[PDB]
Amino acid sequence: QPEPDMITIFIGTWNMGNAPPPKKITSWFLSKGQGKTRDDSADYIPHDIYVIGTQEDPLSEKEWLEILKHSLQEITSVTFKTVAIHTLWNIRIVVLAKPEHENRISHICTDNVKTGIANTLGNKGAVGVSFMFNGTSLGFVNSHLTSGSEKKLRRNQNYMNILRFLALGDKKLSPFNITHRFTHLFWFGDLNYRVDLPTWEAETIIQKIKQQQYADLLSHDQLLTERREQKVFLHFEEEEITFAPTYRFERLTRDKYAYTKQKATGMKYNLPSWCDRVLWKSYPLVHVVCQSYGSTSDIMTSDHSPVFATFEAGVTSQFVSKNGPGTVDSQGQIEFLRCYATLKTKSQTKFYLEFHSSCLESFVKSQEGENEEGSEGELVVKFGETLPKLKPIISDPEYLLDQHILISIKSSDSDESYGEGCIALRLEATETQLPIYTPLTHHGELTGHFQGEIKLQTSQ
Numbered sequence: 001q002p003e004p005d006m007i008t009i010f011i012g013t014w015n016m017g018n019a020p021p022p023k024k025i026t027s028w029f030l031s032k033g034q035g036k037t038r039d040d041s042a043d044y045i046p047h048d049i050y051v052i053g054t055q056e057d058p059l060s061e062k063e064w065l066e067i068l069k070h071s072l073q074e075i076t077s078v079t080f081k082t083v084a085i086h087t088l089w090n091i092r093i094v095v096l097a098k099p100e101h102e103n104r105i106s107h108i109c110t111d112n113v114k115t116g117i118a119n120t121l122g123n124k125g126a127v128g129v130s131f132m133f134n135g136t137s138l139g140f141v142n143s144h145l146t147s148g149s150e151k152k153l154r155r156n157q158n159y160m161n162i163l164r165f166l167a168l169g170d171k172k173l174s175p176f177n178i179t180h181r182f183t184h185l186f187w188f189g190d191l192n193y194r195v196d197l198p199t200w201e202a203e204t205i206i207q208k209i210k211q212q213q214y215a216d217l218l219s220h221d222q223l224l225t226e227r228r229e230q231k232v233f234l235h236f237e238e239e240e241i242t243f244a245p246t247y248r249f250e251r252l253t254r255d256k257y258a259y260t261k262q263k264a265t266g267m268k269y270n271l272p273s274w275c276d277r278v279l280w281k282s283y284p285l286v287h288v289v290c291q292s293y294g295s296t297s298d299i300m301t302s303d304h305s306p307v308f309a310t311f312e313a314g315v316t317s318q319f320v321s322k323n324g325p326g327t328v329d330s331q332g333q334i335e336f337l338r339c340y341a342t343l344k345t346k347s348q349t350k351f352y353l354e355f356h357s358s359c360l361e362s363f364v365k366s367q368e369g370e371n372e373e374g375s376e377g378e379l380v381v382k383f384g385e386t387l388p389k390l391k392p393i394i395s396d397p398e399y400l401l402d403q404h405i406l407i408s409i410k411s412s413d414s415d416e417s418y419g420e421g422c423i424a425l426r427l428e429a430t431e432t433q434l435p436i437y438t439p440l441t442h443h444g445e446l447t448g449h450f451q452g453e454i455k456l457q458t459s460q
């Protein structure tokens, strides 16, 4: 029974509006409705992993697991295994997997983050799950961010708190937040970004939606505009939105957007918006292809419509050689030439690097770099040919070319990371000096760049 080199992953996000779901929700898991939808010919083909995020979920974990599992069994005739379930207040994540994957999945982690302070602490935040699927790390975040059209900055803040404080994945990757810990990270939820147009334009917006003309609405979507200004979700991807706004509907129909201010809304307008989103970030040069992104049309218990997204995702096998794991393979080496970090910091400490990778027995600390002044004010930290030669556990190019090196640049004074990034070993050539590059972030914000050359030796 061969190990897969690809899997498909279903991501669902649904703000249930505190109401029980209808008796049939299969259209959600089939990626049927509006947007980029899944071909009918695939309806019986199970996804490998289903990850369901809910917000304003009124059900018990048991109640929702029974609905989800029975839904999938009706669609696929497969009884899925529960990988993880985690709930914070009314924010929930469920991970289900085909039974054949039960012993491919390990290192299952769950966590939550509560966002805000005092007033603003008590119902928003995020839940998440991570695990290993054979040689591949997967992370999933379901967040319910702050509501309200005039709170996009709060949402951005909620994002940064969640990525800083959600404790998923390998705790040994201490300098790295969840935006660097996973081969594939999926972040979804009721992110609550709105279409920023004047209230007086409500009926115009509705008109545009009825015409399926989304371009002048998407150009005012706060998530797209904040992402373009690098205010949030730096280095994440989102598929093009080709489905109608998923909020705010009158319940029991989809024929009406309920946008007008009400006591129940805190006297706020809810212009039609794409509140409900799926984004991802995968390590460089790993296969990830969105194969659906849309909303259901036939699930109407909530003032939101469910959103679906599906992905092909590259995965690797749990590699064993006669040498590593449990030793190095002297036929493998990773060398860095002419490397330098460019940092936005105004500080003047010395810096050193840490290289972290599951292709190493443990992380590697460099010598301090040499600080120079860049011609436009910047700190340039030069490592020259000084960086330590990295000794991978396995030299086989079928393993090593699929690996990645996480890099942290740390202050010698404080041992605090000033920037984190990732370099793929999926090179054009081995035994050949080749350019490398990663942006450096810290708390998910851009802090610099790391660039130089790499020389990878494999057993071939």
Ligand SMILES: O=C(COC(F)F)N1CCCC2(CC2)C1
Binding pocket: 081, 082, 083, 084, 085, 097, 101, 102, 103, 105, 106
């Ligand atoms: O064994 C597994 C998962 O295994 C495989 F399906 F990922 N779990 C035991 C503890 C409780 C749990 C939520 C159901 C996960």
